[model samples]
Structure formats: C-alpha cells, structure tokens
Target: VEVLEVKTGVDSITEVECFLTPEMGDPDEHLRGFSKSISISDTFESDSPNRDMLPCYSVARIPLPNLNILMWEAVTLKTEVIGVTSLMNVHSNGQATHDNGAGKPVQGTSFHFFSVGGEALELQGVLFNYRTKYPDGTIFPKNATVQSQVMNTEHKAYLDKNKAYPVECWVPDPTRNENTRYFGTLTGGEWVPPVLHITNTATTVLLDEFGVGPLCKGDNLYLSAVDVCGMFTNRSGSQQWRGLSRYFKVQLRKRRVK
Candidate 1:
C-alpha cells in the first residue's frame, strides 16, 4: 500500500513514518530467539566458544520501508535486551551456593556493540585481543588472521590462524561506515568480578547531530549486535556467561534527496 505519518513541517522536513522490527542474529547458533548458557572461563580466549571460551558474535539485518527513490533517513533507535528475567531458572550441573537467588544480573567481561547502516557495517582497526575467532555468515573486517588456530586453553597458546576460523576481536571500524551510525561498549576487561545494574528499560540511540543518519540503502536498514550481556552467578556456585536476544526499534522519516 502506502506510508502513514505525523505532520511537523519546517522547510522540507516531514513526519516520522518508518519503524523497524527486531530481527534475530542470522547464520547458525546465533539464530536463537532465546539463548543457552555459554560458559565463559576466560575473558578473551581463542578456543571454540562453547568449549569454555568466548568467540560468540551475533548479527541481524532488517529491510526498511520503501518510498520510491526518496530514501528514508534513520533518526532514532529504541532498543532493549529482552529476557533478563529468564536467568531465574537456576538448574545446573553443580550445586547452588545458597545465595538466596538463582543468579545475579548480567556482569563480567562483556561486549555490547551495535550498528545501523545503509550497507553492511564495516569492522576493522580495533583489536581487544589479537586472536579472536568469529563464526561464518556474519561479515567481519579484512584484517590479520589467527595463526596456530589450534584449540589451546591451558597454556596460553591462543595468545599467538585461518580457514577453520577467523581474525581477532573487532570493534566497528572508526575510519569508515560514513553511511552508518554505530555505538559499542566493552566493560571490565582483565578486572576481577564485573557488575551492572540490570534494568529492562529500552535505551535510546539518537543521531540528531548527524542530520541525516544512514540513508537506507536498497530500502535496507542493516542491524547488528554483540550483546554478550554478562555472567549469571547461580546458587550452583557456577558462574556462566548469559547472552540475551536483543530487540531494536528504529524510527525513520522521508528525506527528499538526489
């Protein structure tokens, strides 16, 4: 059919007419609407993620509403990590520590990176750890490769490849993504015991300063997330990394363009 709207006239500016639905991270294990308990033994390790380390990255793509060639410019975002309460199910392989609760809110060395771009967001430049292993289907920065890509944990062999794996842990490429709006955060690296005040409030990401934030390319609004929420300390005395499925709501308006 057609698009709807509100009326806020000032020169050529019109009403906000578009919003994006939350999409799940694509490819393999990242596609779950809800996630399983990911055991994170080390803050940054190159071993297989499920095997006691973390190489878990997730992504999703959303198509923007079309309006001729009069593309839509993203204005604001309302996003939230759904299901923070699910951590209440404290069943585990070990015994509980009698902490009176199932577990604590998401805490520990965690990562929360997101980007909304016209095309795919560029990933490069930054390297928290030199030997991070990213899965397939999700695009990554063209950078160095992980050598001796062998699974070594006990002796620090990971601190040192390719084919069966990928490059290092990457943040968004600062130099590029001119058509993208991105923001990321990494907390408590190498620090003992990470903590956060868990509130289920949906946060806002605004691009008002950018004027026109990432004009939709091909009516496509690219969305990606690495919401390694944090760890849950269960009564079982076992601390495990819990990743939650994130939700996104983007607001866009018609922008008359060339």
Candidate 2:
C-alpha cells in the first residue's frame, strides 16, 4: 500500500479506507414506505453492479486498535459517495417520476463526525459537510444549515451555570455550531434529468500546529456519518432524507513531540 508523504521529522502516516452502508434496520418504521433495504446481491459484491436504494442517513462505527497513550494526528481525510445517480427519479411530491423523466438528484450536505469513549480522551470533535457545487462553470448552492445539540467546553459550562433545565431540554448553542468546511452537493433542476455522477470524491487536510485530529481511547474509535441528502418532499407535506452510500479514507500520523 502506498502512503502520502509528509514533512520531515514525522514518524509515519497510516491510511485507512472502508465502505459504509446505512444502518437502515435501526427503528425507522416511519421511513419504511419511502425506500427499501440495501441488497447484498447487487450492492456489496464487487463484480455486480450496485443498484440498491440508500437510506436517508447512512451511519457506521469503525473500530481502531488501542495505541496505549500515544497521540495520533489525523492529517488528511477523503470521502466519496458511490451511485449517486442510480436511483429512480422522484418528483417533488416524493412519487416516482413518469416516462423517462429524470427526478432531481439528491441534494444536501453529507456530514462526518466522530467520538471516542472507553479508553479515549474527552475532546471536542469537528463536523464537515458539503456546502456547494459547480457545473459547467455555473454554481449551485446547497447551503442549508443544521442545528447542533452538541457544545464546546466554554458553551457547556455556560449552560450549566445559566440554566436549571434538565439535560433533556439542553439545545445546541448557535455560537459554537459555526463551521465552513464543505463536502459536495447533489444535482437538481426543473427541466432535463439531473446528471448523476459516480464515485464523487472530496479531500481535505486536517492537521495544524495546535492539533485537531480525534484522540483514540482504548482500542476503539467510533465514527458517525449523516448524509442529509436534502429533502424528499411530497405534495402532501412529507419530507425525508435521500440517503447514499459513502466511502472514507482517513490518514493518521504519530505526532512529533517538543
């Protein structure tokens, strides 16, 4: 396996890649009518064409080896969504389009976040999503913002001091939910079928002087992905996620101490 080279004085960079399918079976009875389960026959097999329908939010938990107390720095992260254009077209009302009509491609941001417990250090994590996309030199925006219930150290303390509400009522502090990183957007338009692309990929560098990568606890790492693939709205006012399959390649390197 080939690894990307970094600056001098670094120990080594480790690269990990895996395919993540949605955990559709986890108590989403309300969403059963909108889509179907991921088929192993056509999706997982490398030789067969992946033609299965994806869930609204795809999630996965990747386990990492316990590295004792050693610090691992995440230097780069790359993500890709496969078969974005393979699903049947759906009208704005969530019904299948008719007669060669191309439905709007799923449009929304794909979010990636992580957490480490058990033997891991408690640290603030960062979330990344797709902000916008361009086609033929024209730009399209998928700039919808998400409300986060999570908080940073300073904000969490402020909540504890100011409010007497129970933990159930704690909401996300808007001040701490600001971020600018983007992944990619799905295609959408009125006339003509939305062009679907295969293996759409994006890469970002994650390391800096202060250290931004997630620290491992014990021998386990838990990663979560939420592809808010926009809304599958119907004329009846029902909206749902247009989920897709995702692939991740995370690169880690041992930190150089002072």
Candidate 3:
C-alpha cells in the first residue's frame, strides 16, 4: 500500500499504510520457554571497508496469551457500538422506523433492528393487513377486505426513572394491525421498555421517524449503517473510534460496474 500527501485546507500528513496479518498460533508456548528478552544487531565490513549489515528494525517473537500486543490485540479484548441509528416510516410500510421507538405495529410500516452484532439482524418486515373485531366492538369492511390504513405515527417510548417511567409519545391508532411483528435487541445504548398509548380509531393516522401513511408487511427502514473513520484512546490511552456512515455504500451500489 502507498500513501500520498497533498497540502490543501486540511492538516499536513505524510502517509499511512496498514499491513494486515493473521495472529500467531500457540501464543502461550513462548511464555514457558523464555525468561528475559534481548535485542540483537549484526554488522559486516565489506571488501571495500564499508558497512554491509544493518540493525534489524523489527523482531519476530511469540507473545504470551496474557501479554498485550500493540493496537492489534487491544481490539481482541474490546468491543464497540458503532454505526447509524435505524429509523423507518409508518406508512404503506408502517411499523417503527427503528423497532426500539414504538408502541404499536401497523401493517405495511417498515421495521428494523438497527445495531451491531446479532445471530439474526437486518431489516425485519413491513406490514400486512388482517381482519378482526375492533376493540370498541366495531366491525369494518363487513366481510373483511384489505384497505391501506395509516398507523399511529406520533408514538414514542421514552425511558423514565423518577416517575412510572419516562413519558413517551403515543401511537394515535387504536387498531394495531395484527400482521405486524418485528423484534430484535439493540447492541448498545440505553435499554428501557416502551410505554404505549393510542388515539384516533379511524380516518387519519400519524407516523414516527419516517412519516405518515399505510404501512406494508415488510419494508426497508434504516437510512444507513456504521463504519469506523478514526479513533482516540480512553483515559488509559487505548484507541477510541470515529464513525463513518453507510450512506456511501448505497451510492457505490447505485453505480454501474465497469
């Protein structure tokens, strides 16, 4: 890899190159055989009386399993929560833009599990309409016909500590479509159950992070994924991280391959 330097509005930087390699096997074997480590150098005089051998800049030594390697092994003992927050609209795709944001699941609304690490993680499903008796004993459609309905878009689940729980925005729709089911755990962030409340039985609906309308059974909701740009260390001087958005990933895919 080669790094080129350019002077412009940005700060001056020479170059950077990353050479990735696999970890050595049997790391603990060296601990039992070695005590103190030493540095070695070699020099040779050529026929012309000039130096021929040079000191080695690096050494090949096996490290103990418990021994700390540089930045590389530092990652082995660390975990991170990096990336975009998942948000979707409750429209023809009505479910929580992010599953963690809602109280009701509307048919056709998009649902997503927005976080890192999971056995099964990704855009779950949109909404699907079903027929059942209304909570207020109102039977619409007479014979059960599918109609594109909006969901309670304004609902939110906030975490509370002092009171019963934090106050959350409410889903204004009473008929939470039975066809909606999206579930997943958030890899990071605070974890608190959502408080749900709905109003307005029929006629109009509200949408959350995304927007208003009838949601479908399964749809895409999250706007982007996460990436690492740069990082800093915590108080102990460990490396920290900077985030990059997946918005470019979409742009790359949209291009035609040469």
Candidate 4:
C-alpha cells in the first residue's frame, strides 16, 4: 500500500486551496500533476469569486496517523472513501517550512467520521467499509468494523459548503487524534442524507473523548470539512483559457505480478 499524506506547513491563520477534476487526471497516473498547493493572503476564501460552493475548491486539514511527520511535510495522505465519482487532489502554502516543527508532545484533535464526510457524500460516518494498512505493513483488506460517534464540540465543528477545510498546528504524537477504539458490531443503513442535525451519539458512551479541559482562553480552534470531486463537464472554456481544467484522471493500482 502507498501513503498519501495530505500535509500543510502553515500558521493556523493560513488557509489552503485545492482542485479536483474527472477528465484531465487519472487514479492510475502515479502522482503526476494530480495535486498542487498555493498559499494565499490572510482572509481569502477558496470559493469567493463564484460563491457557488464548488466541490473542487474546498480544502481540509490533513489527518496524520503517524509520528515524526510534520504538518508542513504532510503528503496527500489517503482517500477515506473509495470509488469517488470525482478525483480530487490538494496542496498548501503560507505556513512556511520553517514553521514546520521538530518532535514535540502529541496534542491533536480527532473529528467525528460522519460529520467529517458530511451528508452530501452519502457516507454513514461509520467505518463500515474502511481500508487501512497497519504500521507493521500487514494488509487488512476486510478489516475490523466500527461505529460513528460525536467529536468533542470544543475541538471539532461541522464544515459548510464551499468553505476552507480546517487547519491545526502539528502534534508530534497524534495519539490525541482518536475518539474511541471499540468492538462495534458492523451494522449500517443508507448514507446519512444531507441535512443539519444535532450531535449524534451511539454505543452508550461517546467517542473522541478529548476532555474539554485543554482549549485555553483566546485559543482559536479551527474546523472545516469539504469533499473533492471531479466533474470535467463543469469546467468552462474560460477555465481552459485560464489554464484551469475541471477534471484530470490519476490512479494508483496495487496489483500483484501474475
């Protein structure tokens, strides 16, 4: 399995931008121009000009599951959901490589899986069909299953459409990046439809228990969520003139030699 570490090396105030397309790129295209990063001014929004909340322009924080990795050095980590209708890739700037820190004690926030994916994507937020490989290099194609739970409100928030994905400082030990690890019976229903709802709770207790005792006064905790999709049809001729292609195809195949 290959690693796609979606990373950032910016101050909390710096926002990132991304683009996804269906036609110009391919999932099989080993890391070509499938992704790029641009650091912008202090208060610029990714979808300001159009204001239509285009999926390709949204950005999010790179969730790192490893230590010894700095935020500035995060690679396009992984795609949580598979068989994406649109292929999306991203990059970041602003927070310079200098801001990228050395080893430090872990202090990161974990998000609610369901809320992270949002209702529009038709995802259950439950790890029903997750695909992860362990650090030991053991492949868990059909891995253990788990349920969704609420992220600590003090630390996480629901991202709006066409908004920048949240960014946070780097924590050497992302052990703080978890809610709960349990034995949830794999039971699921249709994807949670797109709608604003209250905090969701399942399995007696809640997950992501980062007791709300840490956020200090005046500490601005940022959070946002956006899905990347490729829709070449959405690109206009003007886009091409501006050197913007709505969709590009890229793929990575993990096939064994016959």
Write down the TM-score for model 2: 0.45
Writing each residue's lDDT as its tens digit, candidate 1 over 1-258 gives: 122332245532322322222222222464343223444436556533331233344445566555664666677776656665654554543234454533344456666666676667665433444354444532333343443232212112111021111213444555667778777777756333433344535555545463556777787777766566555554444554555655666776666565
Candidate number with greatest TM-score: 1
Query: Candidate 2 on 1-258: residue-level lDDT in tens?
Result: 112333345445566677655432222556532333332343222322111233222233456544543544555666655556544455444433454654544443333232221122212222222221111211111232232123223323121121121111123333442211223333333222334344435566654344445443343333333333444545343434444556667776654322
Model 1 stretches astray by more than 4 angstroms: 1-55, 91-95, 98-106, 125-168, 189-205, 208-210, 232-240
lDDT of 3 at 177: 26
Better of 3 and 4 by TM-score: 4
lDDT of 4: 0.21
What residue runs in model 3 are displaced by over 4 Å at the alpha carbon? 1-231, 234-241, 247-258
Number of the candidate with higher TM-score, 2 or 3: 2
* Span of ten consecutive residues with least summed lDDT in model 2: 159-168
Give the per-residue lDDT digits (tens) of candidate 3, residues 71-177.
Answer: 11100011122232221112322233354644222111111211111011122111123232222211122232333122323222211111111001111122342
Residue 111 displacement in candidate 3 (angstroms) = 17
RMSD of 2: 14.7
* Ordered list by lDDT, greatest first: 1, 2, 4, 3
Residue 60 CA error for candidate 2 (Å)?
Answer: 3.6
Model 1 is weakest, by summed lDDT over 10 consecutive residues, at 157-166
